[PDB]
Write a protein that binds this ligand. Structure first.
Ligand code: ATP
Ligand code: ATP
Lengths: 396, 286, 284, 165, 139
């Protein structure tokens, strides 16, 4: 009751954690646990997570959630232990828990998660939500929407693999989900290579570090490559930037020039030949193709409500460029149509909002702040009396 | 050639044949069907030869009760001798598509990413192999939760393997309950009992020993046996009046022919001797 | 961590981050965080009247009348002097930090802001330690219902201070595990002879409290902590209270971690069974 | 006496694991484990029990196409009782993977197996027998190790807290 | 539903019915042998005229007691010889009584019974156990 239910969003790279009712998460922490090299014991108790677990290099970093799937269940379980007792500081019997999950997890994996939550932490209530549905719900706070709907298309890009998922009435249409290989990490590697070949005086073993910062501080989407290149080659004084970091080795300052990578980094989706050599096919056609694979009768609302999720979507004007390109693809198809040829083509929107970074966590907090959440949770008593049917399935 | 038009399936073939040379639903529109059927006598259901006579004909019978369940509707047509009895015959709304659709929802709740449109045919087959009604719920649920053998594996077209257990019996059941259906029936068994009982009192026993099944919806495994068990309980419950003895005496027999899937067609085909000129008969061809 | 934190980590990271952003010279962003702690304690961190340059920390507690009856006011006023403002509506205590007037040592205020719950409990202990050191015996025992179904008893004796916890274990199997933990606690002097003595009675109160309305039942456990002069004397105090007020949560933490460990071991063995079976399953 | 008992259980399993494919006599086109449904008495064999003492025993129920095996596991004290209950439940939750396990034990036993002709066709029946014996031996050893584990961790936990005063 | 509560199958004429009809070994005789330390002789007498045909469990439970009484009175090293004195039929019957015994453990009764099982198995093979399983008329 009286307290706000704990909201834990375990992502491929970053875990968002906090208490319901809050606008932003209380923690955003790296989703890997640094471990030693069973070890009963004193070896046990010993762990690090976040920043600490990262920080030593030597001592091996694992991905407690990679691709939205728990890497080892034992290590994932230990992760949840410290998530609860060290950071959230919640007495677990007094708080309902909301956890999140990516699409395509099997019911067996859901039972393993619930088994851990109920038989180890004795929680009073648990709900396991699919990331996309709460993220869509999270978008209802945006001014661009006026009526609540739970039908829409979610572009979920993480740090491992981006998924394009059309969802209708709260259930993922599993047969139409598509995966695209490429993510934050690919952007880091290519830009890293790009700096190596152009800028000099950058010590190799701290190349990624620097790389992440440049992307975080200077990347953007440009509207046209050649005009922009000409821009840099013309008004270099107010377009070329300088970045200065400190060498983790020798404690000295290195200054690098920041140029073309600014617009070339986020550009890569758009022309998929960029990102991998294998990707012939651009993002506008894949999203259109995905929508086109679902029933024709339901292809009205899906075009009107494309929502973004994950940090990979926080690059200025991403949605605008996507909206334009999609309008071009749709218009071209209906152009072909007309010529061959009626009903008017539906308007196409992409919803943007201020909480796009961790839309998932926000959605969790908003739903978990309502009485209905308390209604739909599975109680420990029902787990004991019914068993394993209950926790797999959503609330009646 | 014999053409048997059904709401969800059209069986066309020749005479003194076996099975339809073609089973394909027709795409004004009825006249359009001629273009893809005839091109590269007539059979009419109880709105020339009443299918009840037909189904029975192929069985070498003239009297009896025909239970025909297809895609769109299910009928219980009692036939006396050569003719049918347009008055006794009753209709069941109860359904194929709905069950297939319900099985999809149930599998979805289990956690399988099925789509109602894209995967309709696939799940229809899972229903066509694993999934139908059971004698009781509490016992069935126990079998589903306690043995592995509910729990049958089924290979989807993409190679993935899923599991189907309690949903095998869970989908018929909506339809039974008054709860969810929001309509009051019977079924089919109780519907069969009433039809025969509301009939005479002489050839009533005659009907009971000649109940014949027809249509694809009567091919789900165990149907004949379920019908019998339900009729014995209903007979026991009403006419028998709980007398252990009046049970031994009763005669019961549900004819469930191997080729009952297209029993109407099979009938119809060998009915049909050839008239020398086709040419002269009709008003039109006239 | 492992030892429970006096320090609220969410409060410490949030305020440290805010002071560092202030010190860097960035404009402050709004913060509004509502969260809890053990024993029905509720915190709120916000910007009063929407002014992002002011940060208010408010605490709301159920305890409070009982602790107020035992000296709380003097200690809180002694510690927080000036930071302290009129309590926000809906809460019992509010602290206000002006980002435009921060002190030279920010870590010390981060630490003290963490202390907050501990400093709320401290006065009752300090009061009875003074009583004990002065020999004022026969004083009525303090009874603090820190949780809806948990009770705390504090008693001063001639040569010792006893601290009794009446705790409830709602899920049956933790009682069985707990008896093992309390048995190990009973033998703790075999490793630390200068350690505070601990007793435990299951489903029945200690005789000294038998004359009250103490709970009896299958899920109740009584723990007594015997504190000698070495834990009640002047240096001793702060460390003692820091450990004694987190003890209950420490116990619940280790019970849960033991069950978790058993699950991991068990998981490993089931994986091994599946491997044997597949070895057993015919190759073809 | 642990060795002898297992000898008697093993021989009984050898006798009971003589199964064949049996199509249902009761339901058209059904195939069901006869020991579970029990709709044809003539297809059921005489249930037999082997006991080592008042507490440890194995119940073996045969039929033409299936055998149900139930084991009462050694549980000397409370912690062994809870460890055993948790471990059997853990395995039972995973019955789909551990495909010869019943999801619930026969009343009066801690764990039950259901072995059908489909198992004896795809696995060497003599290795199925070896497996049950192996299982009986290993669950006992694991329960003992679990017990030592909890006790060992409890000592370090009491010591770590107490030494810090 | 009600009409579904009745198990009509119990009156199905097509079912299967066992062939049934309508005392045990001599108690006094077994006691005589035992009293005289004649164990093998007691074993052979206890195995006589088993109530394979009675309906009441009282008479069956009686013979099982007598047989069990004898098996318990035996010395470990003398089991093999007694077992080897029996014919195949005796060995099969002994195996039936042994399994019977497994159902009434008390003290170390199962401990010696496991010894009997071992020796009986050595003599009659797994086939003797098979015949415990499919007996329709048993001890
Ligand atoms: N404004 C921004 N500009 C550029 N990158 C950003 C911005 N905001 C966030 N990001 C990036 O997003 C990344 C984190 O992405 P995300 O949160 O989607 O991963 P995740 O949550 O672990 O994945 P998932 O939860 O989908 O498994 C960070 O590495 C960061 O670079
Ligand atoms: N082998 C089978 N077992 C169970 N059900 C089946 C089988 N084959 C088909 N069905 C079901 O039967 C239904 C259709 O039956 P069928 O095609 O024989 O009748 P129909 O000709 O379509 O209908 P009607 O003639 O009554 O208008 C389908 O919905 C399908 O689910």
């Amino acid at each position: 009751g009286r307290l706000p239910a704990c909201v834990v969003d375990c992502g491929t790279g970053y875990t968002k954690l906090g208490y319901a009712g809050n606008t932003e998460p209380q923690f955003i922490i790296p989703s890997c646990i640094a471990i030693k090299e069973v070890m009963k014991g004193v070896d046990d108790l010993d762990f690090f997570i976040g920043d600490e677990a990262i920080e030593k290099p030597t001592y091996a970093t694992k991905w407690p959630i990679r691709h939205g799937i728990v890497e080892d269940w034992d290590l994932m379980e230990r992760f949840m232990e410290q998530v609860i007792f060290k950071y959230l500081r919640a007495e677990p019997e007094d708080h309902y828990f909301l956890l999140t999950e990516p699409p395509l997890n099997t019911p067996e994996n859901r039972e393993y998660t619930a088994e851990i939550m109920f038989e180890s932490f004795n929680v009073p209530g648990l709900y396991i939500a699919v990331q996309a549905v709460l993220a869509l719900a999270a978008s209802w706070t945006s001014r661009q929407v006026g009526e609540r709907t739970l039908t829409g298309t979610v572009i979920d890009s993480g740090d491992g693999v981006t998924h394009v998922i059309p969802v209708a009435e709260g259930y993922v249409i599993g047969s139409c989900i598509k995966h695209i290989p490429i993510a934050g990490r690919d952007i880091t590697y290519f830009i890293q290579q790009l700096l190596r070949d152009r800028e000099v005086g950058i010590p190799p073993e701290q190349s990624l570090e620097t790389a992440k910062a440049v992307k975080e501080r200077y990347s953007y989407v440009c509207p046209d490559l050649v005009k922009e290149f000409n821009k840099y080659d013309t008004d270099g004084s107010k377009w070329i930037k300088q970045y200065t970091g400190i060498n983790a080795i020798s404690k000295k300052e290195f200054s690098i020039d920041v140029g073309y990578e600014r617009f070339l980094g986020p550009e890569i989706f758009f022309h998929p030949e960029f990102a991998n050599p294998d990707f012939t096919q651009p993002i506008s056609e894949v999203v259109d193709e995905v929508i086109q694979n679902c029933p024709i009768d339901v292809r009205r609302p899906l075009y009107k409500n494309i929502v973004l999720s994950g940090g990979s979507t926080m690059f200025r004007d991403f949605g605008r460029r996507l909206q334009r390109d999609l309008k071009r693809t749709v218009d071209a198809r209906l152009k072909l149509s007309e010529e061959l040829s009626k009903p008017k083509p539906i308007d196409v929107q992409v919803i943007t909002h201020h909480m796009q970074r961790y839309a998932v966590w926000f959605g969790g907090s908003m739903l978990a702040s309502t009485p209905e959440f308390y209604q739909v949770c599975h109680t420990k008593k029902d787990y004991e009396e019914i068993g394993p049917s209950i926790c797999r399935h959503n609330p009646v | 050639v014999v053409c048997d038009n059904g709401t969800g399936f059209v069986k066309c073939g020749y005479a003194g044949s076996n099975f339809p040379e073609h089973i394909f639903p027709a795409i004004d529109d009825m006249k359009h069907l001629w273009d893809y059927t005839f091109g590269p006598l007539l059979t009419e259901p109880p709105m020339v030869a009443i299918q009840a006579v037909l189904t029975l004909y192929a069985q070498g019978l003239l009297t009896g009760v025909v239970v025909d369940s297809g895609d769109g509707v299910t009928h219980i047509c009692p036939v006396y001798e050569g003719f049918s009895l347009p008055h006794l015959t009753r209709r069941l709304d109860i359904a194929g598509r709905d069950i297939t659709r319900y099985l999809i929802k149930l599998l979805l709740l289990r956690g399988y990413a099925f789509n109602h449109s894209a995967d309709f045919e696939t799940v229809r087959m899972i229903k066509e192999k694993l999934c139908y009604v059971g004698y009781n719920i509490e016992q069935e649920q126990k079998l589903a939760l306690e043995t592995t053998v509910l729990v049958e594996s089924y290979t989807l077209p993409d190679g993935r393997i899923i599991k189907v257990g309690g949903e095998r019996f869970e989908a018929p059941e909506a339809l039974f309950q008054p709860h969810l259906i929001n309509v009051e029936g019977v079924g089919v068994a109780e519907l069969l009992f009433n039809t025969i009982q509301a009939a005479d009192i002489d050839t009533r026993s005659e009907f009971y020993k000649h109940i014949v099944l027809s249509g694809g919806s009567t091919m789900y495994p165990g149907l004949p046996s379920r019908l019998e068990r339900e009729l014995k309980q209903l007979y026991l419950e009403r006419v028998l009046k709980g007398d252990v003895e009046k049970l031994s005496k009763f005669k019961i027999r549900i004819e469930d022919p191997p080729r009952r899937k297209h029993m109407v067609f099979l009938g119809g085909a060998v009915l049909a001797d050839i008239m020398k000129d086709k040419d002269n008969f009709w008003m039109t061809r006239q | 961590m492992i030892l429970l934190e006096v320090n609220n980590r969410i409060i410490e990271e949030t305020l440290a981050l805010k002071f560092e952003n202030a010190a860097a010279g960035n404009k402050p962003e709004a913060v509004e965080v509502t969260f809890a702690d053990f024993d029905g304690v509720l915190y709120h961190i916000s910007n009063p009247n929407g002014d992002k340059t002011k940060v208010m920390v408010s605490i709301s507690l159920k305890f409070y009348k009982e602790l107020q009856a035992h000296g709380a006011d003097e200690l809180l006023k002694r510690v927080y002097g000036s930071f302290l403002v009129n309590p926000e509506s809906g809460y019992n205590v509010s602290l206000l930090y002006d980002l435009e007037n921060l002190p030279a040592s920010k870590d010390s205020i981060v630490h003290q802001a963490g202390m907050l719950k501990r400093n709320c409990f401290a006065s009752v202990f300090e009061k009875y330690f003074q009583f004990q050191e002065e020999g004022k015996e026969g004083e009525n025992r303090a009874v603090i219902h820190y949780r809806d179904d948990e009770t705390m008893y504090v008693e001063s004796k001639k040569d010792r201070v006893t601290v009794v916890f009446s705790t409830v274990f709602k899920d049956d199997d933790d009682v069985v595990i707990g008896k093992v933990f309390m048995q190990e606690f009973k033998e703790g002097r075999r490793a630390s002879h200068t350690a505070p003595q601990v007793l435990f009675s299951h489903r029945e109160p200690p005789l000294e409290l038998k004359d009250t309305d103490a709970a009896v039942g299958d899920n109740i456990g009584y723990i007594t902590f015997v504190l000698f002069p070495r834990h009640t004397n002047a240096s001793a105090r702060d460390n003692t209270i820091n450990l004694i007020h987190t003890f209950r949560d420490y116990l619940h933490y280790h019970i849960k971690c033991s069950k978790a460990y058993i699950h991991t071991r068990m998981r490993a063995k089931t994986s091994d069974f599946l491997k044997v079976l597949n070895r057993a399953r015919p190759d073809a | 006496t642990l060795r002898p008992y297992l000898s008697a259980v093993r021989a009984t399993l050898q006798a009971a694991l003589c199964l064949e494919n049996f199509s249902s006599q009761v339901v058209e086109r059904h195939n069901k484990p006869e020991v579970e449904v029990r709709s044809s008495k003539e297809l059921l064999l005489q249930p037999v029990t082997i006991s080592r003492n008042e507490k440890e025993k194995v119940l073996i129920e045969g039929s033409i196409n299936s055998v149900r095996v139930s084991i009462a596991v050694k549980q000397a004290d409370e912690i062994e009782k809870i460890l055993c209950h948790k471990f059997m439940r853990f395995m039972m939750m995973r019955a789909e993977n551990f495909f010869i396990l019943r999801r619930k034990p026969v009343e009066g036993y801690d764990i039950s197996f259901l072995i059908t002709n489909f198992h004896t066709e795809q696995m060497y029946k003599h290795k199925l027998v070896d497996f049950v014996i192996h299982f009986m031996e290993e669950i006992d050893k694991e329960i003992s190790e679990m017990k030592l584990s909890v006790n060992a961790r409890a000592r370090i936990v009491a010591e770590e807290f107490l030494k810090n005063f | 539903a009600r009409f579904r509560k009745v198990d009509v199958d119990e009156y199905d004429e097509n079912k299967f019915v066992d062939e049934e009809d309508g005392a045990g070994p001599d108690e006094g005789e077994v006691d005589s042998c035992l009293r005289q330390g004649n164990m093998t002789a007691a074993l052979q007498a206890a195995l006589k005229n088993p109530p394979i045909n009675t309906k009441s469990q009282a008479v069956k439970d009686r013979a099982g007691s007598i047989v069990l009484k004898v098996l318990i009175s035996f010395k470990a090293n003398d089991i093999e010889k007694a077992v080897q004195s029996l014919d195949k039929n005796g060995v099969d019957l002994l195996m039936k009584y042994i399994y019977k015994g497994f159902e009434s453990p008390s003290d170390n009764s199962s401990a010696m019974l496991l010894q009997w099982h071992e020796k009986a198995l050595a003599a009659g093979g797994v086939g003797s156990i098979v015949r415990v399983l499919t007996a329709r008329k048993t001890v």
